[PDB]
Design an enzyme around this catalytic site. Structure first.
Site, short mmCIF file in Angstrom:
data_model
loop_
_atom_site.label_atom_id
_atom_site.label_comp_id
_atom_site.label_asym_id
_atom_site.label_seq_id
_atom_site.Cartn_x
_atom_site.Cartn_y
_atom_site.Cartn_z
N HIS B 41 0.86 -1.22 0.00
CA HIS B 41 0.00 0.00 0.00
C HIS B 41 0.89 1.25 0.00
O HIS B 41 0.33 2.36 -0.10
CB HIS B 41 -1.05 -0.03 1.12
CG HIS B 41 -0.52 0.16 2.49
ND1 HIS B 41 -0.84 -0.68 3.54
CD2 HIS B 41 0.27 1.12 3.01
CE1 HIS B 41 -0.27 -0.24 4.64
NE2 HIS B 41 0.43 0.84 4.34
N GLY B 143 2.55 6.17 9.68
CA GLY B 143 4.00 6.13 9.46
C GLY B 143 4.63 4.84 9.98
O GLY B 143 5.80 4.59 9.60
N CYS B 145 3.58 1.73 9.49
CA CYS B 145 3.40 0.57 8.59
C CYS B 145 4.78 0.12 8.10
O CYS B 145 5.67 0.96 7.90
CB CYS B 145 2.41 0.87 7.48
SG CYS B 145 0.73 1.11 8.14
C1 LIG Z 1 0.14 2.58 7.24
C2 LIG Z 1 1.12 3.73 7.24
O1 LIG Z 1 1.92 3.85 8.15
N1 LIG Z 1 1.05 4.60 6.21
C3 LIG Z 1 -0.02 4.66 5.22
C4 LIG Z 1 -0.66 6.02 5.25
N2 LIG Z 1 0.37 7.04 5.00
S1 LIG Z 1 -0.16 8.52 4.51
O2 LIG Z 1 -1.07 8.27 3.43
O3 LIG Z 1 1.01 9.32 4.28
C5 LIG Z 1 -1.06 9.26 5.83
C6 LIG Z 1 -0.49 10.30 6.57
C7 LIG Z 1 -1.20 10.89 7.59
C8 LIG Z 1 -2.48 10.45 7.89
C9 LIG Z 1 -3.06 9.43 7.17
C10 LIG Z 1 -2.35 8.84 6.14
F1 LIG Z 1 -2.94 7.84 5.45
C11 LIG Z 1 1.44 7.00 6.01
C12 LIG Z 1 2.07 5.63 5.98
#
Ligand SMILES: *CC(=O)N1CCN(S(=O)(=O)c2ccccc2F)CC1
Ligand SMILES: *CC(=O)N1CCN(S(=O)(=O)c2ccccc2F)CC1
Lengths: 304, 304
Positions: B41, B143, B145
């Site tokens: 993702h 962040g 993930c």
């Molecule tokens: C799962 C994970 O850590 N991430 C996926 C979502 N992103 S992001 O799209 O940059 C983001 C940032 C802030 C709030 C929601 C969001 F989906 C970060 C990395």
């Protein structure tokens, strides 16, 4: 989301752990620069531990009697001195993995990570607090002495604890890295009883804030209180008195949640008076007091 | 003495964490040999996350669109492939800090350490269990993930989890390092409800053994039971059924304490039926189920 009892990453401290042997006693040492720090009771026979005279015992010890092993490589001891209840062993090699570091003496209620070690090898990491009675509730078997407690500020490891002993009640006592015991404890196998283990009120309130932030809100009530009223209830329940300094420290959590500190006090008052009634907060059936306000902000904001 | 929720030392895993950026999405990657593993993702816009077609989204991505940073040094991506829900990014440099490692798919009830990371930098380490509903109860902000779960056998890191998502109920779902989700979960922002979070009975019994070993014995009673009788009570309390395989696994703790497994079952039966009555076991007011029998033996014997 979610809130866990979280330790600092241990790698920077793993790189500092060595084995120290004096005679038949093996425990752990902390290697920073060209100094290895370890509990002075490394020089004792368990017989010595009944009433040890460390200065007298140390006279019989030379540099070559302190066997220091880092992995499967021996370090050369070129000097040794006693500072309070620790030995400083000067070695001829600076630890190439020495992180940025400080020695700090923490206050009761402050939390830290422990890297439990045996024979200079890491077995586990867990989060502790310096109890208001200057004990810690750790996990320490024979061989774990010289294991250290620490905090990390980004790249700087603040060492605050070295493990020295278990009281007859299975709680733990140790020193800062200048060898000064927390509390009244001594490195002697004698009658040492801990005082009242009071609850760290400011930490409970931090953790209640963490619960609200993470969606656990059932315990929020319609009441407020005053520091003096709250403190009458705290006293009755063996909770530490709450100071304006504690209220000030909780300000950012207050701000983020919009729950005034004294309102959260009144919630905690009702939980003390009414109990949990079989409910849980952040997966706990008791009020957790080993998160500081700084811990809650750090974990809730994702500091690295 | 003392018994703590203990994570593996994290250093070996800290040396593997990198930052992966695709477009405006930054999360964590695991660098082992010349491969960086991360959640697929990473290629999505939060818009994409509603109903992503990963194969179609991936067509638009080249090696040079995957920005991999290890500390403040960029790695050169020379290949990329999707395996289930992970991306494998081939880089031109083998991670010089690659530990001995395995990829394992764990069973529900099995425990592991999580190294929570943001932008490829470690923030904390905590102990989890794979819940019987194939969720974990973690601590994960945006962040985090690509943060990983692991066990260590002496020098070999078994990676068992990579973090991918939070359900609307604030519990966590992720994959093994072959990219296969634990349970029925999918990397899509959709209606995903967890099933019954049952208590891991064998782990509770392990932890009751740990309590006895560490002097907490008030809950030991005069009764025994049978697997079938115990299991009727387990069912009623949303506890996992106890198998002879679980009894066999608890044998060494039985041996050490001299408490027959079925006797300890009868103690647990009375605790379920009578509750704790305001008492604690190893500083807990509920029955802890995130220690395996292996965890209890390891911590009680001091394995490094
Ligand atoms: C799962 C994970 O850590 N991430 C996926 C979502 N992103 S992001 O799209 O940059 C983001 C940032 C802030 C709030 C929601 C969001 F989906 C970060 C990395
Ligand atoms: C505190 C600590 O970890 N140590 C001091 C005691 N020694 S020991 O004298 O070798 C020992 C070994 C086994 C049982 C008791 C005992 F005191 C180990 C290091």
């Amino acid at each position: 989301s979610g809130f866990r009892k979280m330790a600092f990453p241990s790698g920077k401290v793993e790189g500092c752990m060595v084995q120290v042997t004096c005679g038949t006693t093996t425990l752990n040492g902390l290697w920073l620069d060209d100094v290895v720090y370890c509990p002075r009771h490394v020089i004792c026979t368990s017989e010595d531990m009944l009433n040890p005279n460390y200065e007298d015992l140390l006279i019989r010890k030379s540099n070559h009697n302190f066997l220091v092993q880092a992995g499967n490589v021996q370090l050369r001891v070129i000097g040794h001195s006693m500072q309070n209840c620790v030995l400083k062993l000067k070695v001829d090699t600076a630890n190439p993995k020495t992180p940025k570091y400080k020695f700090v003496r923490i206050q009761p209620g402050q939390t830290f990570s422990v890297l439990a070690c045996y024979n200079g090898s890491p077995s586990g990491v867990y989060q502790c607090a310096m109890r208001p009675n200057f004990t810690i509730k750790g996990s320490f078997l024979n061989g774990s002495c010289g294991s250290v407690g620490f905090n990390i500020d980004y790249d700087c490891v603040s060492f605050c604890y070295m493990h020295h002993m278990e009281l007859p009640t299975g709680v733990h006592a140790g020193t800062d890295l200048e060898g000064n015991f927390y509390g009244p404890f001594v490195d002697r196998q004698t009658a040492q009883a801990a005082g009242t283990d009071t609850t760290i009120t400011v930490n409970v309130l931090a953790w209640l804030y963490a619960a609200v932030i993470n969606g656990d809100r059932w315990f929020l009530n319609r009441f407020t209180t005053t520091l003096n009223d709250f403190n009458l209830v705290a006293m009755k329940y063996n909770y530490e008195p709450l100071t304006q300094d504690h209220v000030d420290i909780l300000g950012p959590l207050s701000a983020q949640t919009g729950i005034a500190v004294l309102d959260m006090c009144a919630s905690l008052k009702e939980l003390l008076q009414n109990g949990m009634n079989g409910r849980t907060i952040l997966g706990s059936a008791l009020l957790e007091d080993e998160f500081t306000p700084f811990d809650v902000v750090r974990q809730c904001s994702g500091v690295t």
